[PDB]
Design an enzyme around this catalytic site. Structure first.
Site, PDB file in Angstrom:
ATOM      1  N   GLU A  50       9.296   8.014   7.735  1.00  0.00           N
ATOM      2  CA  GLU A  50       8.237   8.820   8.073  1.00  0.00           C
ATOM      3  C   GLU A  50       8.730  10.061   9.340  1.00  0.00           C
ATOM      4  O   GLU A  50       8.174  11.188   9.220  1.00  0.00           O
ATOM      5  CB  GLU A  50       7.221   8.014   9.216  1.00  0.00           C
ATOM      6  CG  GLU A  50       7.624   7.564  10.413  1.00  0.00           C
ATOM      7  CD  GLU A  50       7.031   6.819  11.365  1.00  0.00           C
ATOM      8  OE1 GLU A  50       5.798   6.595  10.857  1.00  0.00           O
ATOM      9  OE2 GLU A  50       7.172   6.300  12.435  1.00  0.00           O
ATOM     10  N   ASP A  88       0.395   9.018  12.286  1.00  0.00           N
ATOM     11  CA  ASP A  88       1.822   9.099  12.117  1.00  0.00           C
ATOM     12  C   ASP A  88       2.298  10.257  12.632  1.00  0.00           C
ATOM     13  O   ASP A  88       3.458  10.008  13.375  1.00  0.00           O
ATOM     14  CB  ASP A  88       2.079   8.833  10.510  1.00  0.00           C
ATOM     15  CG  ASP A  88       2.427   7.665  10.212  1.00  0.00           C
ATOM     16  OD1 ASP A  88       1.271   6.473  10.424  1.00  0.00           O
ATOM     17  OD2 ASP A  88       3.248   6.986   9.186  1.00  0.00           O
ATOM     18  N   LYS A 114      -3.352   3.857  -2.038  1.00  0.00           N
ATOM     19  CA  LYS A 114      -3.273   3.975  -0.627  1.00  0.00           C
ATOM     20  C   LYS A 114      -3.676   5.662  -0.267  1.00  0.00           C
ATOM     21  O   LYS A 114      -4.010   5.827   0.762  1.00  0.00           O
ATOM     22  CB  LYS A 114      -1.716   3.833  -0.281  1.00  0.00           C
ATOM     23  CG  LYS A 114      -1.486   3.965   1.217  1.00  0.00           C
ATOM     24  CD  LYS A 114      -2.615   3.427   2.115  1.00  0.00           C
ATOM     25  CE  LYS A 114      -1.745   3.095   3.310  1.00  0.00           C
ATOM     26  NZ  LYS A 114      -0.959   1.871   3.627  1.00  0.00           N
TER      27      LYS A 114
END
Ligand SMILES: [Mn+2]
Ligand SMILES: [Zn+2]
Length: 1617
Positions: A50, A88, A114
């Site tokens: 990420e 995030d 998703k």
């Protein structure tokens, strides 16, 4: 510990790039323990992934994992109590957020699901955030693999492998283990035995509601006895009581009914088609006004074109001043012309391009002279410097290439202008908005005025199509009941003769329907012809087809030559009918003509449905359909007013009337209205479901049902299976009786039907769903806005020009004012609106990034206070709730801090809002500026089961399933429509997962059907068998039953297939194991509990808001029970085109059972062919056809007992049999001319002229295959050539298919007719003969004697001249012959590549043989708009060299120099010295002729070398012929052979761009029949030339293999041998 210890040492090759990397690495290395190790390992992996993904977007990594409310509280933002969300990555700047959430999903299914679930959750936050705060750009950065920029892409796979090894080695539950394992593999069909199948205390009810009466083991004698008893009961309780469903014809009754329903006698319309229709009247007026009755013009047109070109650059950043400046130039040049040569303002203008008190201007606009001089009077006195600086601004920072030496700087002398203005008086147009018949009796005119009517219709249609071409982003100088005096109206011109022209005035731009006014101009006196209302994009068919329709009408008239006196009474009425259909295009005409087809089918035969005439009537509106209905019904009554079967000639009448009924194909199929069609589609989808009474409202979409929902589902299922064999009250209601199904299945199991279960080859081997068809979805819009904003933010390392718009045009259409103009002009009007919305959103976002109300006179109290609280933001604020005048007067607010003085085009950041507001205020756009003022005014105000599903955990993967779901969704679907000619068809679009499951069941059913025999749906051999059987049955005179089943889609249910598959056995081929159909039943249950999403547009239209049951249902469920319904789940759907093969299998089984029953009872011999929607049953009867009515009615009754209701369109008889729209008559087959002609005139999908020519060639081949004509194909050829020529491409020697062709479309490919065209160019065929002799010599030399090799290839690629001279010297020649052959040249525009042009495509995005091979290796838009895009894109800088330039610029470099050899074919063939100025665009036509001859000899024999010899019948005797080709190239010519020679000869082209996705090079490398005889050279020629296409014809089928032709054409053919 093998891998545990190695794990610490393997991650030692990691870079501690950030503080968090080292902070977690120190914890990792100093902590080894089996329980906490895996969790922190997963955390570290996800953290690095990420972090890289966000830092790719200049993120600010979220290290504390805090919400958005807290991070807004850290800065200064009030808390609006948003939903709790952990992002995030966040980036606050000014007054905007950049929020990004990332994830990794190895398989596409989870990636898509998703992505949708994350985009929706981010999007649900912005509505609440923007209400009292900031606006955010959401970014969703999904990756399909774990690679990043921090590791060398070698450690990640190894660490994942060792980590999964550790997980599968030591543990510490049930499905979490499997979900951890499944999320780390790379790639991974039926046999889903890894699933759990856990019950839910509900499926048991499904079990005893579906499988309570299915046994499938009944004996045979009991079935026979029951069927006998049933027939005995039906004979005396349902048939003799008049409760049947089929009846005899009684010709007179049908004729009376047709005359009563079609020919209106209660209507007030008169019997003159011209009077009722407005366009028809205008056409008549223009025709009968025209039939009965200089270099300054070129200079004016040239300067007008130059003015259009200069206006296209928009170098003035303003719209009013540019139009004023061009007007000033035009009036100055007008007075410059009119100063001298006094015989000009009345000679070359009144007879040219000018009308009463109006001059034509830039952008196809017509403006009054008085208003022009009045506007030029303005900007003077207040801005005296307005002219001079403009004259100075066209030289500096400008192209500086202008011929306005004096017309530009000149101050307009207003005295002379006003003198010209007063020279002629006002006769301005009127534009009529919103009676004695003097019409000369169309039936009684000469044979010349009718063709003039057709020509006038063609001209007016072309004018409308051109009216579509006006630039969308154009505004009038002065804007505007029932009559309006035009002053700035747009106009288009169309020519009729030397003096009179026709003008067509309109007031709006775009694709919508408008109101036009047609005027004439004979000799400067402008008359009124009329005014009408139409949609321009529905008039493309007659644009040039003024001779095709005449040809087809004459042929259809000649078809009735058996009675001299019948064609004279049916010709003119047929022509009038065709013309009326052309002038009145609507869906109702199509539906009525289809009804006429069904009426004809019923009339010809002997038995037809009792409820037929109720399906023919279509209500009439606007009185323009009444006339065409009257004409058609009169034609039908005039023709079929005789007897049937036994007649001197009846087949001709049937042929003629069927062709008349297919006139509905002339009208296009392009959805007159889109919202209306969506509403109608939703109605057709939802009416039966609520009539049945089983439609639930929004489910959980997660596999959970409440007690009421399951109760209603079970009740619906019981009602479906609650029909008895005796009751007659349920014949039209859905449902199947269990007794008859038991009989059918038991009889099928014991191999008694014509099919049985001895199958071989064992079968078991991001679009948003709630708007389909919308040009740009919400997801794509938000993605595009986020991408543009992120690129802007990363570029600012502020100020921002308008070049930002260029960036947007990179992402809509796939590819510096020239580039911007070319990209902008390729967008349709709706696409322009979407682009403007994206523009506004991006500009507002940047303006927010950069960081009074008591003006009450008539609003604010009630208008804007309730308008802002109304639907969402003012970005969708309608301009109708507030009047236009009050908008304008409210804009009269003075200049303040809200404004700024000056346009300020450079626009540094911090002033975006004010700058756009001021610029829009300066122009005419007031409502946009009002919206801008509104927005500036702020008027929008350690557990391992739950704490592990946040980082990269594929929680939504299929691991355990139930009877209604799969823990991974509920098989969502979508709704859309597919256009047809009669009525639109349903269309179900599914998500990826549901697509996979449907594909699995589809494959299984397709395999099972492929085992069986009698189905003909995806097996052409069975279709050919059916055709042959139909032909022989019609010849013999047996009984034929064409059964079309009604509502096949919205009636059948997955439960029916579930019962059928539960009761079957499907024995294995050689094992007899009784295959277990568990997975198939599970998928069918999943279909039984599927979800269909309603369109968002329908919901909006029904919410905002004529009686309909769907609307009352929607309002009844609005808030009486719950919320707005957005999902519908039910029992009986069987999505159209989703379970096609399963439905085919069920229909086949039931039909075979019915055939067995008929054979058992009535001792007849039935044979049936089914296509899953329609079927044909051919019945041979022993031992006049009125005593079979009982059998037909019994068959219909038994079918209705099953779920196979028969539509009234079905027909039983002995004259004509129909199957898949192929009508057969005793002796021959009906041609269906008009269908093919209309198809050829339509679907002109153009991308390059060569491709258009090839497509028209294929369509014309298919047309002449079905015996249409040879005099009609030439006219289509001329139409295509003229369409190419009008586009500005100019005529080319190859062009479209040949003119003046012959019956020899047979035994001849595209190359042969190209060769014929070239041979037709040369009259005395001297040079052609010489080249042919040289070709024969080379062909013999390569065939035998001096056999050559690939060396010749080295000569092909050098060029054109060199190749021809080399082949001439190889054959043997001298300098004289070579220099004589190389004399003929033609202009090749696509010499240095291909035309650069962008077309009207959809948003969001080397020789051609490579592309064709790549295509072979693997596995809504209208026509008029596409053609307009083609024409507009071929008028800009297209042809390339060295740089781009125009086509006219290239063609102006040629010199006339007509000496001896440039007059045999003007503008096609030139001599060498005539092309000195433009020599790079010059290639010898003889080289292409040589290539064509050689390739034709290679393909279809050596007979193409001889010379043509011309040879030294009632036009109705048809007969069939076969191709007579002989091949010398190993005709079988399998695959993997061309690639072998290509690899031998072009290794670089084989390695690059060829076979990346190829996995069988071993067979293609081991000389798999390599070194073919001619293929060595017969493939290199196509590599260099772009219009041979011999490779594409090598690996294909003839697709016809038969041609029906006439004795008239076979005797006129040319003999060549
Ligand atoms: Mn049919
Ligand atoms: Zn009339």
């Amino acid at each position: 510990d093998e891998y545990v210890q190695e794990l610490k040492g393997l991650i030692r090759k990691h870079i501690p790039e950030r503080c968090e990397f080292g902070h977690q690495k120190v914890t990792f290395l100093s902590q080894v323990h089996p329980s906490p190790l895996l969790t922190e390992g997963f955390k570290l992996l996800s953290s690095l992934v990420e972090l890289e993904s966000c830092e790719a977007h200049a993120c600010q990594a979220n290290t504390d994992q805090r919400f958005v409310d807290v991070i807004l509280s850290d800065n200064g933002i009030l808390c609006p109590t948003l939903p709790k969300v952990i992002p995030d990555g966040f980036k606050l700047t000014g007054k905007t957020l950049i929020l990004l959430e990332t994830f990794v999903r190895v398989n596409p299914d989870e990636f898509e699901k998703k992505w949708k679930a994350d985009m929706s959750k981010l999007l649900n936050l912005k509505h609440d955030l923007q209400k009292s705060g900031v606006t955010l750009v959401p970014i969703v950065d999904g990756r399909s693999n774990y690679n990043n920029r921090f590791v060398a892409d070698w450690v990640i796979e190894r660490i994942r492998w060792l980590l999964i090894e550790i997980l599968k080695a030591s543990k510490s539950e049930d499905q979490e283990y499997q979900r951890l394992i499944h999320s780390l593999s790379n790639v991974k069909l039926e046999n889903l035995e890894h699933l759990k199948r856990n019950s839910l205390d509900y499926d048991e009810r499904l079990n005893e509601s579906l499988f309570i009466g299915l046994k499938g083991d009944i004996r045979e004698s009991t079935v026979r006895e029951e069927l006998i008893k049933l027939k005995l009961w039906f004979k005396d309780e349902v048939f003799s009581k008049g409760l049947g469903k089929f009846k005899l014809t009684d010709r007179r009754e049908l004729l009376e009914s047709l005359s009563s329903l079609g020919a209106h006698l209660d209507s007030d319309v008169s019997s003159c088609p011209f009077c009722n229709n407005k366009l028809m009247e205008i056409v008549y007026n223009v025709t009968f006004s025209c039939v009965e009755r200089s270099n300054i013009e070129k200079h004016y047109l040239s300067v007008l074109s130059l003015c259009n070109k200069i206006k296209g650059l928009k170098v003035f950043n303003t719209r009013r001043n540019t139009l004023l400046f061009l007007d000033l130039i035009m009036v100055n040049l007008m007075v410059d012309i009119s100063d001298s040569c006094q015989d000009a303002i009345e000679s070359l203008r009144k007879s040219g391009l000018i009308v009463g008190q109006m001059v034509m201007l830039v952008n196809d606009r017509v403006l009054d002279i008085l208003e022009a001089v009045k506007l030029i009077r303005k900007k003077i006195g207040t801005n005296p410097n307005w002219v001079k600086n403009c004259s100075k601004i066209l030289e500096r920072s400008h192209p500086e290439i202008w011929h306005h030496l004096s017309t530009l700087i000149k101050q307009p002398d207003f005295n002379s202008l006003i003198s010209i203005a007063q020279h002629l008086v006002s006769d301005r147009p009127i534009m009529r908005y919103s009676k004695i018949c003097r019409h000369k009796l169309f039936q009684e005119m000469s044979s010349f005025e009718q063709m003039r009517l057709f020509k006038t219709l063609s001209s007016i249609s072309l004018s409308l199509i051109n009216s579509m071409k006006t630039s969308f982003s154009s505004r009038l100088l002065v804007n505007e009941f029932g009559n309006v005096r035009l002053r700035e109206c747009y106009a288009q011109r169309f020519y009729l003769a030397e003096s009179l022209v026709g003008f067509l005035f309109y007031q709006k731009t775009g694709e919508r329907s408008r109101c036009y006014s047609v005027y004439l101009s004979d000799n400067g006196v402008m008359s009124e012809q009329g005014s009408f209302y139409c949609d321009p994009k529905r008039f493309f068919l007659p644009v040039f087809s003024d001779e095709v329709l005449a040809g087809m009408c004459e042929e259809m008239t000649s078809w009735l030559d058996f009675d001299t006196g019948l064609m004279n009474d049916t010709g003119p009425i047929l022509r009038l009918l065709v013309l009326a259909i052309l002038c009145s295009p609507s869906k109702r005409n199509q539906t009525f003509l289809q009804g006429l087809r069904y009426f004809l089918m019923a009339f010809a035969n002997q038995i037809h449905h009792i409820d037929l005439t109720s399906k023919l009537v279509v209500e009439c509106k606007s009185s323009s359909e009444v006339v065409v209905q009257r004409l058609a019904v009169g034609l039908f009554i005039r023709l079929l007013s005789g007897e049937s079967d036994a007649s001197l000639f009846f087949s001709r009448r049937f042929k003629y009337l069927l062709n008349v009924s297919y006139l509905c194909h002339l009208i296009t199929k392009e959805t007159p209205d889109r919202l209306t069609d969506q509403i109608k589609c939703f109605e057709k989808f939802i009416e039966p479901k609520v009539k049945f009474g089983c439609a639930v409202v929004n489910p959980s979409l997660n596999g959970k049902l409440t007690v009421d929902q399951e109760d209603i589902m079970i009740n619906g299922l019981k009602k479906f299976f609650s029909k008895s064999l005796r009751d007659t009250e349920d014949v039209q209601t859905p449902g199947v009786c269990k007794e008859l199904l038991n009989y059918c299945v038991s009889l099928f199991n014991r191999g008694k039907l014509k099919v049985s279960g001895e199958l071989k080859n064992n079968p078991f081997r991001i679009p948003k769903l709630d708007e389909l068809g919308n040009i740009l979805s919400t997801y794509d819009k938000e993605k595009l806005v986020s991408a543009c904003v992120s690129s802007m933010a990363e570029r600012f390392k502020n100020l921002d020009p308008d070049s930002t718009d260029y960036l947007i045009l990179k992402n809509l259409t796939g590819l510096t004012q020239e580039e911007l103009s070319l990209m902008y002009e390729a967008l349709t009007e709706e696409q322009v609106e979407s682009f403007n919305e994206i523009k506004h959103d991006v500009q507002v976002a940047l303006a927010k990034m950069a960081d009074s109300p008591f003006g009450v006179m008539k609003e604010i109290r009630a208008e804007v206070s309730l308008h802002e609280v109304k639907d969402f933001d003012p970005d969708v604020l309608p301009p109708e709730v507030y009047k236009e005048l009050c908008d304008a007067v409210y804009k009269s607010s003075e200049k303040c801090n809200f404004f700024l003085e000056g346009v300020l085009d450079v626009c540094p950041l911090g002033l975006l809002l004010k700058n756009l507001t001021t610029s829009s205020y300066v122009d005419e756009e007031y409502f946009m500026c009002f919206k801008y003022l509104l927005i500036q005014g702020h008027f929008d105000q350690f557990t391992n089961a739950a704490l592990r599903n946040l980082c990269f955990y594929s929680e939504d993967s299929p691991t355990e399933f139930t009877s209604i779901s799969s823990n991974s969704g509920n098989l969502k679907f979508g709704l859309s429509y597919k256009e047809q000619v009669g009525s639109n068809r349903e269309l179900y679009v599914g998500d990826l997962n549901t697509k996979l499951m449907t594909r699995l069941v589809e494959d299984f059913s397709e395999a099972v059907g492929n085992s069986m025999k009698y189905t003909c749906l995806n097996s052409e051999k069975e279709f050919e068998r059916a055709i042959c059987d139909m032909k022989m049955a019609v010849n013999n005179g047996d009984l034929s039953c064409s059964y079309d089943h009604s509502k096949w889609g919205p009636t059948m249910s997955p439960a029916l297939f579930l019962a059928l598959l539960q009761m079957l056995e499907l024995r294995t081929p050689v094992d007899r194991s009784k295959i277990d159909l568990d997975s198939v039943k599970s998928i069918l249950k999943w279909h039984l509990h599927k979800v269909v999403e309603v369109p968002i547009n329908v919901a909006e239209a029904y919410c905002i808001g004529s009686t309909s049951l769907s609307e009352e249902f929607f309002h009844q469920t609005m808030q009486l029970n719950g919320q707005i319904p957005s999902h519908i789940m039910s029992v009986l759907d069987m999505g159209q085109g989703i379970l096609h093969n399963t439905s085919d299998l069920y229909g086949l089984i039931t039909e075979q059972f019915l055939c067995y029953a008929l054979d058992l009872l009535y001792d007849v011999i039935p044979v049936s062919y089914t296509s899953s929607d329609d079927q044909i049953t051919l019945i041979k009867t022993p031992s006049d056809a009125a005593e079979w009515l009982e059998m037909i009615c019994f068959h219909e009754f038994l079918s209705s007992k099953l779920n196979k209701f028969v539509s009234p369109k079905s027909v039983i008889g002995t004259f004509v049999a129909e199957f898949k729209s192929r009508f057969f008559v005793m002796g021959e087959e009906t041609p269906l001319l008009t269908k093919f002609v209309a198809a050829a005139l339509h679907n002109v999908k153009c991308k390059t002229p060569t491709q258009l020519s090839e497509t028209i060639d294929t369509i014309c081949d298919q047309c002449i295959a079905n015996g249409v004509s040879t005099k009609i194909v030439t006219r289509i050829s001329k139409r295509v050539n003229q369409l190419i020529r009008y586009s500005g491409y100019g005529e080319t020697p190859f062009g479209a298919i040949e003119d003046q062709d012959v019956k020899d479309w047979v035994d001849g490919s595209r190359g042969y007719r190209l060769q014929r065209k070239i041979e037709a160019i040369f009259h005395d065929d001297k040079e052609t003969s010489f080249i042919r002799n040289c070709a024969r010599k080379v062909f013999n030399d390569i065939k035998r004697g001096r056999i050559f090799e690939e060396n010749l290839i080295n000569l092909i690629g050098r060029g054109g001249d060199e190749a021809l001279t080399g082949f001439l010297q190889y054959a043997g020649c001298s300098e004289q012959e070579v220099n004589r052959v190389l004399n003929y040249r033609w202009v090749n525009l696509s010499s240095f590549g291909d035309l650069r042009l962008v077309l009207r495509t959809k948003l969001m995005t080397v020789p051609t043989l490579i592309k064709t091979l790549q295509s072979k290796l693997s596995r809504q838009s209208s026509v008029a708009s596409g053609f307009i895009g083609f024409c507009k894109s071929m008028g800009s800088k297209c042809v390339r060299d060295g740089g781009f330039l125009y086509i006219k610029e290239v063609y102006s470099g040629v010199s006339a120099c007509t000496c001896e050899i440039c007059a045999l074919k003007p503008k096609i063939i030139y001599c060498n010295n005539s092309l000195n100025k433009v020599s790079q665009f010059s290639k010898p036509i003889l080289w292409d002729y040589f290539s064509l001859v050689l390739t034709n000899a290679c393909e279809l024999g050596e007979w193409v070398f001889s010379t043509v010899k011309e040879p030294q019948n009632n036009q109705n005797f048809f007969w069939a012929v076969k191709p007579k080709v002989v091949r010398q190239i190993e005709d079988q010519l399998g695959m993997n052979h061309v690639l072998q020679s290509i690899r031998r000869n072009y290794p670089v082209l084989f390695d690059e761009h060829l076979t990346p996705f190829m996995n069988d090079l071993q067979v293609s490398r081991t000389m798999d029949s390599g070194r073919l005889k001619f293929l060595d050279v017969c493939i290199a020629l196509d590599m260099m030339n772009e219009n041979l296409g011999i490779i594409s014809h090598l690996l294909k089928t003839r697709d016809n293999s038969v041609y029906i032709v006439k004795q008239s054409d076979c005797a006129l053919a040319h003999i060549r041998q």
